[PDB]
Every structure is written in C-alpha cells, then in structure tokens.
C-alpha cells in the first residue's frame, strides 16, 4: 500500500526527479496537520462499536425487509456477516485516514466488492446507506469541539468523508 | 511501500484490527522524527549535483582502473562515465525518497530488491557503490539529527551492498 | 443441512463409497423416531400462539427491568415488545423445523451460527432467552417420547445459549 | 445438501412460517414410504458393480467408436475414468434416492460436469447413453417383485427415473 | 511420455537449470543404446502377426478353459477371441513404442494407468496376458542387446501384472 | 512432455498402428544426428550467461525507453525479472533442441505468456527483440566451425533457428 508520502514519492520516481520545494513545502504541511489526523483515528476507532451498531439499527428500522424472513440480513449468521462487513468498512475508513491516502481501501476491501455482493444477492444499495450513516455519524464524533484543543479541522473531515463517499460508491 | 504508517497499517490488517494506540503512536513518531528527515531531503536534493559529481570522482579516484579498463562495465569511455553518474544519482534520489517517506520502503523496491542480480549480471562492483556512498556521507555538510537521519539510510544502502 | 439422511450421505461422500447397511440404518432409526418427532412438531405448532406469549410474560417475569429500562434493546416500549415476541417465536419455529428435520440442522443454520455475535452486538441477555426456553419445556404439554424429542432440541438451544 | 424434509422447512424458513397440517401430511407419509426407499437404495447399490460393468459393455458394443484407438475410452486409463464416471454418476443417483431430494445430485456432481467433459473431448452424447442404460437396470432391480414383501413401488421408480434422466440431460 | 530425454528435461526443469553434462551424458547413453533398441522394434514389428497369433494360442493352452467356458470375458466366443488377439497386439505395440521412446513411456501411459482397475471390472486374469507375454519373451528370435532390450520390456510388463 | 521419438510413438498409437519401415529409418536418423544435437545444447548452454546479457545489453540500447525512469526494465527489480524471463526463454528453447521437439517449450512457457506480459504492461515486441538477439548468438555459437569435427549442421541450425522464432511469435 501506499500512504500520502509514498504516493509522492512514487509519482517522482515514475518521472526519474527529485522532489520540488512545493512538493517538500506540501508533505511538510501534511506533518504538522498530523495530530489533527491521530485524533479523528483515534476518536473513530474509539466508537467503532456504537458507530457500527446505530448504523445497523437504523438502516433495518428504514428497510425492515432486509430483516424479514427471506431478507439479505436474516437469520443470525447472515445479519452477522452484515454486521461484520460494516466494521469492516469503518476499518479500512480509517486505515485510510491514518495514511492521508485511499490505497489501502482501494486495494483491500473497495476492488471487487460490487461483484461480490452482486454474487451473494445482497443489495449494494443498502450497504450504501449504511456506510452513509456510519459517515456521518465517524464525522460528528471526529470533529466534536469538546475535549480537544480548538482549531479548524474542515479540510480533514472533507477528505474523511471522501473516503466513506467512495466506498458508498464502490458498492452502490 | 514500507514507511512508520504503511507499517502500522499492515500490522493492525494482519490481526484483522482496528488501529490501537499501540500504532498511533508509532506514526507520532514518524511525524516528530519528520522534521529532521526532511531537513536532510532537502538537503541532499538541493546538493545534489555537487554531492553526485564529487562521489563519482571519489569512485574513480579510489579504483583508477575504472577510468581506463576496456569494457562496457567501466567508465572509461563517455558512456560508462554517464551510466555511472546516473547510477550515483539513482542512490542519492533514493535516499531523499527514504527521507520523505520515513522508512527504506523507497529503497528497498525500487534499488534493493534485484541489485545483486544486477551488480552480477552486468559486472558491476558493489564496492564502487559503497565508496560513492561513502563520499556522500562524509560530505553532505549536515549536523545533528538531520546527519543521523541521512547516514541512517546511506548506511543501510551500505550494508546492502555488503 | 444437518439431518441424519445428509449425515449417512455426508459420511459415504466424504470416503467416495456407496452407501453401506452402516448408514441406511441410521436413516432407519431417523424414519422411526419420526413418529414421535412429528407429534411434537404438530403440538408446539398448534400451540404456538399461547406458548410465545406464556413464554414472554415468563420473561418479563423473571427480568422485570426490562420491561421498563430505557433503551432499544429492552421491551419497555411497543416496538421492543414486538421484537422480544418475535424473536421468541423465531425460536419455537427453529425448534418444530429441527423435528421434522430429524436433526439440529435447521437451528444450527438459521439460529446459532453468528448468535454470540448477535447478543453482543444488539446487548441482549442470553439469560432472556434461555428463560423463555424452559418455560416453553416445562409447558409444552407434551409427555413420552414427543417430550423427549422436544426437549432435546430446546436443551440444544439453551446449551447453544450458554 | 438437503433432504426432502429440510427442503420443505427450508421452504418455510424463508417464508418465516411454522408448518401447515398439509405439509405435515406430506412428510409423514414420506416416513411412511421410507421402507420402499430404503429398498431401492439397497438393491441398486448391492448391485453397483454389475449394473455399471453391464452398461460400459452395453455402450461400447453398440459404439464401437469409444474403444478404437483414439477414441475417448481407449487405453486403459481412458477406459478406467470412464468406469470411474459411470460408478460415480450411479453413487450420486442412489444418494439422491435415499434423501428423496436431487439437491446433492445437482451441486456435487451434474452441475459443471458438461463443461468439463467438453474441454475434455469427451461425448457427452454417449455419457447420457451410458446413464440411461444403468437406469433401466437400477430400476429393473430395484422393482423387482422377487424376495421381498409385495407392495406398490411404482411412484418411487418414477421419482428414480427421474434423477438417471437428470444425470443424463446434465452431460448430453 | 517418460523417455532418457524427457526425464533428463525434467530434472533440469525441476531445478530450474540449463541442461548439464549430467542430463548429456543420459541422452548420449539413450542414443547409443538405440541402434539395439529399434533393432529389436524392427524385429518384433516385422513377425508381429507370428507372435500375436503363438502367444494367444500359447494362453489357450496353458488355459484351457478360456476357450469353453459360457461369459463374455472368456475367448470361447467369435468375439472374444477377437479381443484377446486384439489385447495381445495391444501389449506387442507398446513394447515396440517402449523401444523406440528408449523408456517405459508409452506403456505406462497406453496400458499399465489403469490396468489394474480394467482386469478386475471385466473380469480378465492378469495370468492369461503374463502367459503371452512369456510367449513373445521365448520366440522373439532375438539374441545379444537385442533381446536384452526387448526382454526388458516384456519383463516391465510382466511386473505390472504381477 | 514429448521429444522427437516419443512424437512419432503418440502419433501412431492414435492410429492403433506399429511403426512403418519409412518412420524407423526416420528415426534411426534422428539418433545417427544425436552428436550434432548435444554439441549444440552444450554450446549454447555453456554461453547462457553471455548470450543473455550481450542481447539485454543490445536491446537496452536500442531501445532507451525501457530503462529510462519510467519504463518496463526500470528499477532492479524490473530489470532482474526482465533479465531472468531473457535466461527462462533460452532454457526452454535449449530443452527443445535437446527433445528435438518443441512441445516442452509450448507448454511450460510459452503458452499464456503473451497474455501474462499484456497484464504487466511489459512490451512484447521489445521481448522478441530480446529473443531473436539471443538466436542469431546462440546459432553463430553452436555452429562455429573451429574445435568441432567438421561437419554440415544446416538443418539443425535451421530447427533451432525456429524454436526461437517460434518464441519471438509467441509474445510478440
Ligand atoms: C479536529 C479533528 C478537532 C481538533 C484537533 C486538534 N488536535 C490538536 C492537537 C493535538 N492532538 C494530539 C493527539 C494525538 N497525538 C498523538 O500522538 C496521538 C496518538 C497517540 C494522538 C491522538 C496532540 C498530542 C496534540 C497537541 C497537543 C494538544 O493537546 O494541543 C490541535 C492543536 C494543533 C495542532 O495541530 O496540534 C487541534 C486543532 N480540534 C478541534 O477543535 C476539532 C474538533
Ligand atoms: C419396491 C421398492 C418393492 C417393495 C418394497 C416394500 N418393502 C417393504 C417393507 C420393508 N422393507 C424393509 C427394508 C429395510 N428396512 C431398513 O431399515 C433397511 C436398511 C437397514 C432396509 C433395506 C423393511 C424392514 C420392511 C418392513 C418389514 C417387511 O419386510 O415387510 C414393503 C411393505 C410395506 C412397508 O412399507 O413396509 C414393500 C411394499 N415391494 C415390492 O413388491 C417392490 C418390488
Ligand atoms: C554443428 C553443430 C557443428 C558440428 C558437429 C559435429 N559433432 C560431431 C561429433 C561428435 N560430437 C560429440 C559431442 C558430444 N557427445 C556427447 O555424448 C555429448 C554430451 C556428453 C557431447 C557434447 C561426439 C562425442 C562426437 C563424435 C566424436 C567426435 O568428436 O567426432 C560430428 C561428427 C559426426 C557425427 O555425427 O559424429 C559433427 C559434424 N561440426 C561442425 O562443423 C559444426 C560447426
Ligand atoms: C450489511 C450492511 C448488508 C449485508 C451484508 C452481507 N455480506 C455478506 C457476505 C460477504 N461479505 C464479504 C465482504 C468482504 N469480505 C472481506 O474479507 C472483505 C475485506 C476485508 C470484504 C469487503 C464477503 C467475502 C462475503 C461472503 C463470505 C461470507 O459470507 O463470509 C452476507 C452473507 C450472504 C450469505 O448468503 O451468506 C451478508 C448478509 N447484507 C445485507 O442485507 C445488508 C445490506
Ligand atoms: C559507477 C559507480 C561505476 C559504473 C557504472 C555503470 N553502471 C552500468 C549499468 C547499469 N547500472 C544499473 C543500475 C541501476 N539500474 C536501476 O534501475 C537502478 C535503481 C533505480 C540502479 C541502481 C543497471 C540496471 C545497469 C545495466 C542496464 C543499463 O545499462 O542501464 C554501466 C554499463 C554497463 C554496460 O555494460 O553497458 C556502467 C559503466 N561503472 C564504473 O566503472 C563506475 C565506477
Ligand atoms: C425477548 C426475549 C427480549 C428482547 C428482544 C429484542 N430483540 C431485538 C433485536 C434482535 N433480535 C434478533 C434475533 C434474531 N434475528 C434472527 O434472524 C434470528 C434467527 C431467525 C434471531 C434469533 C436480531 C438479529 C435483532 C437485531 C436486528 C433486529 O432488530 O431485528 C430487540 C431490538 C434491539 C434494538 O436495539 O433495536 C429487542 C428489544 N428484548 C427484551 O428486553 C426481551 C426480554
Ligand atoms: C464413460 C461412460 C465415458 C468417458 C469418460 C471419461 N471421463 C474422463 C475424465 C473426467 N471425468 C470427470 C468427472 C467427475 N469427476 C468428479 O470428481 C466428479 C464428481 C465426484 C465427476 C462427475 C473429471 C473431473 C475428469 C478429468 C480428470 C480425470 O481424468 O481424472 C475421461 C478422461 C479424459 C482424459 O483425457 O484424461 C474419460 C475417458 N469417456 C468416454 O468415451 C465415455 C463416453
Ligand atoms: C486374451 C489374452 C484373453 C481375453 C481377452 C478379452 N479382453 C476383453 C476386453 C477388454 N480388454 C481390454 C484391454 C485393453 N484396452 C486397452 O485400451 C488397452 C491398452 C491399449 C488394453 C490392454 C479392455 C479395456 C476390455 C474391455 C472393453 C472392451 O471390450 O474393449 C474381452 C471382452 C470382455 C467382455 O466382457 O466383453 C476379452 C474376451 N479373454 C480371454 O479368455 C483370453 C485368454
Ligand atoms: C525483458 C527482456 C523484458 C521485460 C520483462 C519483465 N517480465 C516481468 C514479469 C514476469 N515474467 C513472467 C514470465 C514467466 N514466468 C515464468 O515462470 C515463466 C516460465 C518458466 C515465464 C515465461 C512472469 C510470471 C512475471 C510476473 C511475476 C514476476 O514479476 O515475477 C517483469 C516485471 C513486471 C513487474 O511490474 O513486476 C518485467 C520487467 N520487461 C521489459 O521491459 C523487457 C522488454
């Protein structure tokens, strides 16, 4: 995989070059957001369970199909493997984060899920949904003024929510 | 790519895990430690043409005979003194990547894997490579962590090469 | 889906032979054991209706509080007293389908499998549950081996609970 | 795989619904018929050997084309797979039989075998001969009144039948 | 198809090596051991129809009751004397491409894969086809490294059946 | 695999057929040529090293795009995986001239490689480039006429020259 230096870092290699002062001035703007980064990780991954479960309960309260004997996520083991492929997302969300780069999502988990659940049956439309929820509700508890040093994460949470949009869009 | 954040990644992946505090912190590291690699990046990179000309002529001068000896291995022709700058370049640019992306991943795939193939292959001597390293780092003029940073990774192609 | 037919066959597979006496016997024993099986299905089916809603208000007998804690996963509310029902019945529906299946199958697939996951993840007790097992056993009203029969599949689904 | 029974409750699963006295009805003289199965199962398979030796004999007598040199069942390991096929294609008939549900017929050997047998090389066409051959004998055995208690088999050979004709429409 | 050149292909490739002077020696020895190999191929090609009818009489006689006994697998029948001097032909060919191939090859792939299972679904005594074979061993006519070539593979055959 | 000989076998055993009086002499031929054979499987092997690298070496310099930055041979571990499918290919070309037949070629590399390059993104036509410089060295080296028996090795030359054009075809 590659994080956000990496990906610098291979895009100069492919072209023989050493890097630029803009470039050098851009990576060393990405280290001093740093601590802005470590908290979003730490405060998604802090309520991975309670983020994952809300989603979950509100999406079978909105489509209550999927629960209905017959539905994609009845029966025990098929709402538990739905369980899991919510944390699963979440997971590499943040994996994503924590690199400054959609790589690892990319690679492995995004690449090959639509065809997966296209196999399976299960609605890639209402995985969207999920991973909507669980973005929204990553970002306020991200970005929640309380308990932290104040300052203007925006952009963060702009690319944080890029990285949920594009794992709604690879299922949907 | 292998770098602090790639690293934790592929840990907490491999155990099917959320990140821990275990791997933020690892990557704070990385973000401290930062300051200093990317004093030496810029660095090198700014010099680097004095640094790649002066190590070459360090290579030439310890092993004459690289100058004179017939063979397209050597540098006695205008082709091998432009392959062997270029090769020199190649281990200075891969150092400045190690820098900037906080580990030997940089290195490690793009020079490192296949080089003793490649050193064999062509009849290339490993030992030219260490002395042009060897100039580099007794010669980029940096102090402090900055030259811990930057001899950390010019050690590590050494130790490569051996 | 486990039953003691795709057992024999299972078996016979998996060693790449015909089926032998060794297995048609067990089916055999699945074809006579049916009869009382088959009268405990019909029974708990007929009765369905008391036995879910005896069973519940056995429950919220046992676990008052959660018939008024706060929160979704009790049944302090309509919706949450709806899902209790529910599920309850989810469960006598598993126990006649293991009967007239012969064998656990029918619960292990559509109950058991991923159920540690499911009250963990939702916060409901085990406990709730296996108390509405027993009262299900202790008033199903069935006697011989119909009884027997129904037992075994509740006492699976309490062991599986515990 | 499934048997008759899971294959009803499995019906009703999906439904979410308990059991109707029809259907009740209908598994219980299922049980009641299990004897005649069981026979069934018994006979064929005691008979396994001959009943696919008889039919290879049979099949190559009357297409002497298989056996020629460059045929699909000469030399002997050619000859020993097809044996291996037919022997195989009776195992899963008779399992069919005794589940009293084609389910295992169908996933663990029909489905995909004429692909196979097409990148193979191997005539499909005779294989349904071959299948067709062994069920007259299956059922000839099977059916027969002698050394056993008399009583009418008749929808069982018909239910029989019909996985050998299933098998065979399978691979030609 | 196993053959001194194929085999010696194999190691190479196995090993993921250029062919060495150890794989050239083998060949050598396969190209030199050729001139009494195709000898004896020559030679039981030639009287081919000789020996197939001698050897299939040969198990008629140590046999007798091949010839009068009521089954399909028994040569007491139009049909099944066809097949036994077909079978019979079937070996002598082999032994001839065994001789050419310089290996086993042929054999093993043509007749040996399988032989076992074939004999016991048809009901065929291995004894019958080891009586021809000893025939064809006995009356070949061949002498020297001839023979020594062609009584190894009726002898590998024998084997196989034994 | 197959070699010469066991190809003529195959081939009438197809046919149920011993071997004509035409095909032996054929044959017998075959080994009467054998010295010529391993003369030239243990030049051309004894030189392996050198044939690859002064045909990667004339390539590259041909052709500058592929070790530039950038390009398919760029990087050590693009060059070394490039160098070592260059030694792959003479090995198996080499075994081809020792079966005196090319099948073992076809099968363990040939076969799919187009596909497999197109994949990588590795230009099959600069491949071939490689291959045809490896032929016109290893040909001038197995048919030097100094410390060898004197002899014509035309047809020979000729055989191998098509196993290697026959690679050259088969990725390009
Ligand atoms: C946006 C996401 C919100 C926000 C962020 C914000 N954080 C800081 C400063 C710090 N954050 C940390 C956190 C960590 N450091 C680590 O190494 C790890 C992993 C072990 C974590 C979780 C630290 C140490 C600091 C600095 C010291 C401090 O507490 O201030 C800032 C300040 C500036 C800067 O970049 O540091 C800001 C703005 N603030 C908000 O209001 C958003 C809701
Ligand atoms: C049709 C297939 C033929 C036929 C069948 C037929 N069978 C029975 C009765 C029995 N069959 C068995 C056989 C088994 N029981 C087993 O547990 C096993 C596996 C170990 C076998 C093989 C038994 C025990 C009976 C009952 C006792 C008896 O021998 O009668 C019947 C009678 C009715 C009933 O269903 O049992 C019938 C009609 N009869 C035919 O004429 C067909 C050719
Ligand atoms: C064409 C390729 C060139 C050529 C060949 C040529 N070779 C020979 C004869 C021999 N070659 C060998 C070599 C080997 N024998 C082996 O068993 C092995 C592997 C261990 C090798 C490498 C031998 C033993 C001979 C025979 C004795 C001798 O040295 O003469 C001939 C002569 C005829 C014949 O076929 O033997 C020829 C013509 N000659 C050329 O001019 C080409 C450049
Ligand atoms: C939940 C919101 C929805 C839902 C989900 C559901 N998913 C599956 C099955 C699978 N999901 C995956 C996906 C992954 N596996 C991975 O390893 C990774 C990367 C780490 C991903 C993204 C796979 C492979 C499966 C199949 C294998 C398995 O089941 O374990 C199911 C099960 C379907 C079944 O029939 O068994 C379900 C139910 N279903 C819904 O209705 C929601 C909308
Ligand atoms: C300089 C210290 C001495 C010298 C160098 C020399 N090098 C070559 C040829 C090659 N060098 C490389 C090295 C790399 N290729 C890479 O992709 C990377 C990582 C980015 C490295 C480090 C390679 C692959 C070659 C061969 C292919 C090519 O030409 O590019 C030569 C030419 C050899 C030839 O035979 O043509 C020379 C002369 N030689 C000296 O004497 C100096 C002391
Ligand atoms: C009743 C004894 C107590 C009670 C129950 C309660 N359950 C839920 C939610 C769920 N129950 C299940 C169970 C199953 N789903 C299945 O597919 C199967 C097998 C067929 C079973 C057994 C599941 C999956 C859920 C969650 C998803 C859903 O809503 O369907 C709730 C609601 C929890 C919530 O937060 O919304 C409740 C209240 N609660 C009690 O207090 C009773 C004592
Ligand atoms: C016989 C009546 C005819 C015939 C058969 C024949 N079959 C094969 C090869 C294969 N058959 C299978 C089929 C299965 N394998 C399984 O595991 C199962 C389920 C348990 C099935 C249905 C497979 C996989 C093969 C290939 C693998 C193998 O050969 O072992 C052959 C061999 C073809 C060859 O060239 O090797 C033959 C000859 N051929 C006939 O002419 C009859 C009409
Ligand atoms: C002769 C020594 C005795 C004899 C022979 C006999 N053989 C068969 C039938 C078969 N023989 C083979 C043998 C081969 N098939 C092959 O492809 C190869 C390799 C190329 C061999 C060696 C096979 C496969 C059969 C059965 C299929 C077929 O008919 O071809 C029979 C007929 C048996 C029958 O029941 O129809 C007979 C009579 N029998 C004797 O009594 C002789 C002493
Ligand atoms: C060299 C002249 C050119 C070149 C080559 C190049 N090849 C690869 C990668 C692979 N080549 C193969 C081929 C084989 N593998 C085999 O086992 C066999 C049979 C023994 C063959 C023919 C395979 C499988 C690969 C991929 C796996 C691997 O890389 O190990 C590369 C690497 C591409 C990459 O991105 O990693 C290269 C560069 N490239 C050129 O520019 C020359 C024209």
Chains 1, 4, 6 share one sequence.
């Not at chain 2, 281990?91 to 296949?114: H, K, N, Q, S, W």
Request: proline share 3%; hydrophobic share 45%.
């Amino acid at each position: 995989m590659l994080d956000a230096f990496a990906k610098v870092v291979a895009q100069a290699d492919a072209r023989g070059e050493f890097l630029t002062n803009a470039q050098f001035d851009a990576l060393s703007n990405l280290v001093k957001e740093g601590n802005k980064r470590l908290d979003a990780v730490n405060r998604i991954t802090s309520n991975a369970s309670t983020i994952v479960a809300n989603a979950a309960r509100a999406l079978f309260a909105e489509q209550p199909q999927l629960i209905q004997p017959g539905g994609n996520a009845y029966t025990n083991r098929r709402m538990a493997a739905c369980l899991r492929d919510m944390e699963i997302i979440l997971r590499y969300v943040t994996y994503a984060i924590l690199a400054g780069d959609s790589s690892v999502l990319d690679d492995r988990c995004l690449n090959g899920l639509r065809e997966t659940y296209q196999a399976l049956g299960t609605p890639g439309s209402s995985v969207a949904v999920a991973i909507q929820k669980m973005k929204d509700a990553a970002i306020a508890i991200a970005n929640d003024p309380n308990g932290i040093t104040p300052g203007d994460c925006s952009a963060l949470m702009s690319e944080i929510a890029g990285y949920f949009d594009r794992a709604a869009a690879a299922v949907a | 790519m292998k770098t602090p954040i790639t690293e934790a990644i592929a840990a907490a992946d491999t155990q099917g895990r959320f990140l821990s505090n275990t791997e933020l912190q690892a990557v704070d590291g990385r973000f401290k430690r930062a300051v200093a690699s990317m004093e030496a990046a810029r660095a090198l990179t700014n010099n680097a043409q004095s640094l790649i000309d002066g190590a070459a002529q360090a290579v030439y001068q310890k092993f004459p005979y690289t100058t004179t000896m017939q063979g397209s291995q050597y540098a006695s022709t205008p082709e091998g003194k432009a392959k062997c700058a270029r090769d020199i370049g190649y281990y200075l640019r891969m150092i400045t990547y190690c820098l900037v992306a906080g580990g030997t991943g940089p290195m490690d795939e793009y020079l490192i894997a296949g080089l003793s193939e490649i050193n064999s292959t062509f009849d290339l001597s490993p030992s030219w490579y260490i002395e042009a390293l060897k100039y580099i780092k007794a010669n980029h003029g940096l102090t402090g962590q900055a030259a811990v940073e930057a001899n950390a990774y010019i050690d590590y192609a050494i130790n490569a090469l051996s």
